[PDB]
Amino acid sequence: LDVLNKKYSLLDHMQAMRRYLLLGQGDFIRHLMDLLKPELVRPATTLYQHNLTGILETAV
Amino acid sequence: LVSGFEATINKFDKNFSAHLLDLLARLSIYSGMASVISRLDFNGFYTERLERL
Amino acid sequence: REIITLQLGQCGNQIGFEFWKQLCAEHGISPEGIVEEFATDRKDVFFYQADDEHYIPRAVLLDLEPRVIHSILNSPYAKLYNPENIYLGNNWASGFSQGEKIHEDIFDIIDREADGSDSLEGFVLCHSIAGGTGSGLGSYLLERLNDRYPKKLVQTYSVFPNQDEDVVVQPYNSLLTLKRLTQNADCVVVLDNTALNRIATDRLHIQNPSFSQINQLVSTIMSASTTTLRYPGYMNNDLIGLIASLIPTPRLHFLMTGYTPLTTDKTTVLDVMRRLLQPKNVMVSTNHCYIAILNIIQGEVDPTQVHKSLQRIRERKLANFIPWGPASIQVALSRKSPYLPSAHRVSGLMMANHTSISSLFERTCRQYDKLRKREAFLEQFRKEDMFKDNFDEMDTSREIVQQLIDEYHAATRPDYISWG
Amino acid sequence: REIITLQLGQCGNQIGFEFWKQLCAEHGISPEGIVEEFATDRKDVFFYQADDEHYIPRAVLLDLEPRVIHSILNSPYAKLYNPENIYLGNNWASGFSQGEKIHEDIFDIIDREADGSDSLEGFVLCHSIAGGTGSGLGSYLLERLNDRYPKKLVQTYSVFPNQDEDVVVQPYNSLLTLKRLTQNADCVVVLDNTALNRIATDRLHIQNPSFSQINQLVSTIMSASTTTLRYPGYMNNDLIGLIASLIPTPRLHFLMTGYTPLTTDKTTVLDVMRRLLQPKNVMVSTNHCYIAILNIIQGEVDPTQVHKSLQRIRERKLANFIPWGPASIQVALSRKSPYLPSAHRVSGLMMANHTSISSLFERTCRQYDKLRKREAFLEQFRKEDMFKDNFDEMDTSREIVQQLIDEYHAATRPDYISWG
Structure with missing residues (x-):
């Protein structure tokens, strides 16, 4: 328990998984859908993944 | 006199813009690592003049 | 290489005296020229x-x-420099005629330092526009200067x-000086006495010793403009390398100044970059938009975050700079200069090409227009x-x-592929 | 996103000053704007x-x-905020005419913060109805506000x-303000000076510093209305998300306020829900029945029992809310806000659409009717x-x-599938 609780963390790491992946924070998903308005409504099969990840990194 | 000068300026400008967009295209297949394209096209100047596909 | 300065x-003698004193204060030297023991x-x-x-x-020195000049004479900064260059009206025409007769001896003063120098890089001019004694004389000497040496650069x-x-003759004087300032000068750094006076009354409550504090401001600007040259840098360690990027069109050479702290009596990169971007930290005061901006930073700066800073200032998207061919706001980063005590560490200086100075030009053109139409303020002298x-020199300047x-205005248009 | 507030x-300046002070007190900040070390x-x-x-x-700030305004000026909460927005009668017509001439400069004050903001979400109005200086001026500025920006929301x-x-001119002033309050405002939170005065004389023995304590009440209500936005919540973290559910009909937008402790100088969920339901904890004072109620709770609450609480308040069956289409009393649950000391932990606030305010409207309509029929109290001014x-604006408002x-009354009927 202690080796994984001090060179990484476990509970604190799982809380953000709840916040982003399980949509536990509505604010991040709100601005996620706001800022990614044209890239979503327009097909993203004509577009590389790095554009979405790059705008996501500033969205949070 | 200017029939050599402006001709060479024109053709060199056209081929220069061609190879410039060639560099941006051959770097567009790859992805900060995209700071190179976003800097060279800072604030979206001629991200769109003559673009294909 | 080696740059010869003029005042x-x-x-102009005040700002040059302050500049040389302020670089004596910056460098590890005595006011006699003796190097200090902690010097590179x-x-x-x-x-x-x-x-x-x-x-x-x-x-x-021209006076x-x-x-x-006597106050400059009886000072311990006359032991720093004394190349024996001192050589003795309030109109542009009077200063022009006085410069007319004695051009050969002051040109010998020029050629003395020209042969004394092994290499030559440029000529910096400290000139006061419509300064009385300076006006006319400076225009004539500017004309002779670019006439003699077309292989060098001129900053004014x-x-x-x-x-x-x-004074009612001042728009005529500044107009004739502006004609030579256009066609006989290759780079112009323009300052506003109004904007500097407003910022001086802003940060402090002084309005009477305005010249003395404005000396401090201009000396800091001139030192910060040359820090990459005076200290070991990598780009624009020559004047011409700096001048080359900023000018896309050889008459668009007018350079705008701002400075990130306003009061001088931890922050990040994109912060002070953004604050240098704003016009209210710009100390010089239809669409008006920048052609190209260059900025220098000097201070305590964490160097690895500048690219994310670059991205953040990009997507903040503060200026819609130009139509036709692609310029940028362009960064340079420098170290804060050693060999002196340093307060207010993070300090930035920006050089920009902006069409907004056409408004100030139209201001003085309108002043000249009304004074010319009224025709009681030309102050006709022999x-x-x-x-x-x-008086067709006024027409040519006009x-x-x-x-x-x-x-300016056609460059602001999306079409400047046609000339105008 | 970003909401711009008006006072x-x-x-209105008193309640805004108290609101900003009370949120300075809530948040971990100094009265200068400096963040504290325990902050998110x-x-x-x-x-x-x-x-x-x-x-x-x-x-x-409008004054x-x-x-x-001078008392607001000489305070340590003028170091918290000072955007330099200060710009200088007791009638609605006088305030209307005074707002008429200077609309452009205060509109520049508006556009300054509008361009200063990156995003815009809504405009909150702190306006005192029939306040003398506030009346007329606030109505005019409300009209210009919804005229300029139809893409935002207005709360008043x-x-x-x-x-x-x-004062005999006050029903005319409040009536004209009520006309603009209907047709130029999208959400109205109405308060009663009588009900607040009665509760202040109830819990305490004060009746003379009523304004000062009413400031405390309204600032607590305004902070509790925004706690889900200011602290990380999940629903109605925007203003419009809150406003959307409460309004079934675009002129039924009048919002009723209650608060579960009455005196502020372990209980369970359904308890304080039931006490928030009662009209004697409602601090604003044929059938009258609620259209829809929304409630927010903030305090120490055991979260797993809320559904059994929901069942118990259902089968208690306290209000026969509406006929035609199905609304509800709708719960929201929040955490008690950190970064400040917290006494009286379990505190609830309710937003409700009730037709009972039509009684108060008929009260002031009857007052206007008798003052109009007597015709010695219009106080005819130029x-x-x-x-x-x-004076057909009174007829249009009427x-x-x-x-x-x-x-209101046809919505109370089982038939509002026909309009009326």
Whole structure:
């Protein structure tokens, strides 16, 4: 328990998984859908993944 | 006199813009690592003049 | 390589005196030229490696009716430099005619330092626009300077003379100086006495010793403009390398100044970059938009975050800079200069090409227009008549400044692939 | 996103000053804007992330005949915010005509913060109904506000001005303000000075510093209304998300306030839910029945019992809410806000649409009717005549408030599938 609780963390790491992946924070998903308005409504099969990840990194 | 000068300026400008967009295209297949394209096209100047596909 | 500096007029002699004193204060030297024991850097950009391990600045002194020159004389900064360059009206025509007769001896003063220098890089002019003694004399000497040496560069440090009302001959003087400033100068750094006075009354409560504090401001700007040259940098360690990027069109050479702290009596990269971007930290005051901006930073800066800073200032998207061909706001990063105590560490200086100075040009053009139409304020002297009987030099300057306003405004248009 | 707040009148400036002070007290900040060391939460809803790590509130100050503004000036909460927005009668017509001439400069004050903001979400109005200086001016500025920006929301914090007898021109002023309050406002939170005065004389023995304690009450209500936005919540973290559910019909937008402790100088969920349901904890005072109720709770609450609480309050069956289409009393649950000491932990706030405010509207309509029929209390001024010669604005407001009472009463009927 202690080796994984001090060179990484476990509970604190799982809380953000709840916040982003399980949509536990509505604010991040709100601005996620706001800022990614044209890239979503327009097909993203004509577009590389790095554009979405790059705008996501500033969205949070 | 200017029939050599402006001709060479024109053709060199056209081929220069061609190879410039060639560099941006051959770097567009790859992805900060995209700071190179976003800097060279800072604030979206001629991200769109003559673009294909 | 080696740059020779010029100063004329009492205001130009004041700003040059302050600049040389302020670089004496910055560098590890005495006011005699003696090196200190804790020195390194490049000290050949304006300092002659003189004969007693003196770094003597290479400065051309020009004066008429000497008042401030005696105060410069009885000072311990006359032991720093004394190349024996001192050589003795308030109109442009009077200063022009006085420069007319004695051009050969002051040209010998020029050629003395020219042969004294091994290499030559550029000529910096400290000139006060419509300064009385400086006006006319500076225009004539500018004309002879670019006439003699077309292989060098000219920078001219200029003020915009109007204290918003006084002297009625000043728009004529500044207009004729502006004609030579266009066609006989290759880079112009323009300053506003109004904007500097407003910022001085902003940060402090002083409005009476405005010249003395404005000396401090301009000396800091001139030192920060040259820090990458005076200290070991990598780009624009020559003047021409700096001048080359900023000018896309050889008459678009007017350079705007701002500075990130306003009061001088931890923050991140994109912060002070954004604050340098704003016009209210710009100390010089339809669409008006920048052609190209260059910025220098000097201070305590964490260097690895600048690219994310670059991205953040990009997507903040503060200025819609230009149509046709692609310029940028362009960063340079420098170290904070050692060998002196340093307060207010993070300090940035920006050089920009902006069309907004066409508004100030139209201001003084409208002032000239009303004073010309009223025709009681030309103050007809025999100097002006003998210099030009029909006063068509004003007409030539008028069509040239019209062409420049046209150049500004058509450059603001999406089409400047056609000329205008 | 970002919400810009407005305050006008001395009472509105008082409640805004108290609101900003009370949120300074809630958040871990200094009265200068400096963050404290124990900070997190979302602090961009009304606070500009200013230039010295200051969270400067974004508040529009409007004042005429400044009395309280000097007291706001000489305070350590003028170092918290100072966006330089200060710009200088007791009638609605006088305030309307005074707002008429200077609309462009205060509109520049608006556009300054509008361009200063990156995003815009809504405009909150702190306006005192029939407040003398506030009346007329606030109505005019409300009209221009919804005229300029139809893409945003308007909330107006309103009082019901009558101390049950005084001033005879006040029903005309509040009536004209109510006309604009209907057709130029999208959400109205109405308060009663009588009900607040009765509760203040209830819990305490004060009746003379009523304004000062009513400031405390309204600031607590305004903070509790925004706690889900200012602290990380999940629903109605925007204003419009809150406003959307409560309004089934775009002129039924009048919002009723209650609060579960009455005196502020372990209980379970359904307890304080039931006590918030009662009208004697409602601090604003044929059938009258709720359209829809929304409630927020903040305190120490065991979260797993809320569904059994929901069942128990269901089968208690306290209100026979509506006929035609199905609304509900709708719960929201929040955490008690950290970064400050917290006494009286379990505190609830309810937002409700109730037709009972039509009684108060009929009260002031009857007051206007008797004052109009007597015709010695209109207090005929040249302002009112020049604004409207025939005084048919009163007639237009009268037919509109008749339509609204009709809307209330026909909504109370089982048939509102036909309009009326």
